[PDB]
């Protein structure tokens, strides 16, 4: 199949035509997406298959073919870059200074960019091009805009 590093779409033919349910990161031969995108289901790559390895509904994260490999963290200061892969549309880098989710269990970065649900699993990048987390778990604000948590995992 395909094992190359990079950003991928996640597609299904279970609905009308070919529908994009979300997006993920291939790194070190491991595929990273958000639990809500696949609900832990197996994935096809050519005639290659990808089985789930790790997943957590509360982290809203899942890895395939190996443990979670992305460790980089938002510094709390710098503009990041999202890599939006919207349905039917080319990958596009959007620059934004994150906001914060204040939780009863510590602070996490947040990104106030409007994209449709299928963009879920689109990655967020620091200035060295490291994936500091994944975009598409979050909350609707007064405005009616979207603000994703910056979701990230732990590397063993």
């Amino acid at each position: 199949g395909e094992t190359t590093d990079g950003v991928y779409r996640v597609m299904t033919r279970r609905l009308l035509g070919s529908t994009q349910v979300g997006v993920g990161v291939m790194q070190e031969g491991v595929f990273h997406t958000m639990w809500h995108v696949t609900k832990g289901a197996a994935l096809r790559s050519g005639e290659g298959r990808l089985d789930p390895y790790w997943g957590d509904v509360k982290q809203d994260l899942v890895s395939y073919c190996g443990p979670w490999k992305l460790d980089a963290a938002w510094d709390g200061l710098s503009e990041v870059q999202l890599l939006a892969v919207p349905p039917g549309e080319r990958a596009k880098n959007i620059q934004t200074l994150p906001g914060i989710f204040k939780t009863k269990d510590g602070d996490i970065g947040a990104v106030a960019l409007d994209y449709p649900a299928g963009t879920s699993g689109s990655p967020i990048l620091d200035k060295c091009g490291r994936v500091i987390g994944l975009y598409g778990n979050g909350v609707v604000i007064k405005n009616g805009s979207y603000v994703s948590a910056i979701t990230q995992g732990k590397r063993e």
Partner: protein
């Protein structure tokens, strides 16, 4: 059934479009992984 397509490389792009705000939000995180606005 679900399949993946390489949609691009992962790089920082010098002069990307720059947009959005940076709001500070009080939220909860439930057992189901749902974030909600605390006020």
């Amino acid at each position: 059934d679900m399949y993946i397509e390489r949609a691009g490389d992962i790089t920082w792009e010098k002069d990307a479009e720059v947009t959005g705000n940076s709001p500070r939000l009080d939220v909860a995180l439930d057992e189901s992984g749902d974030f909600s606005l605390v006020e």
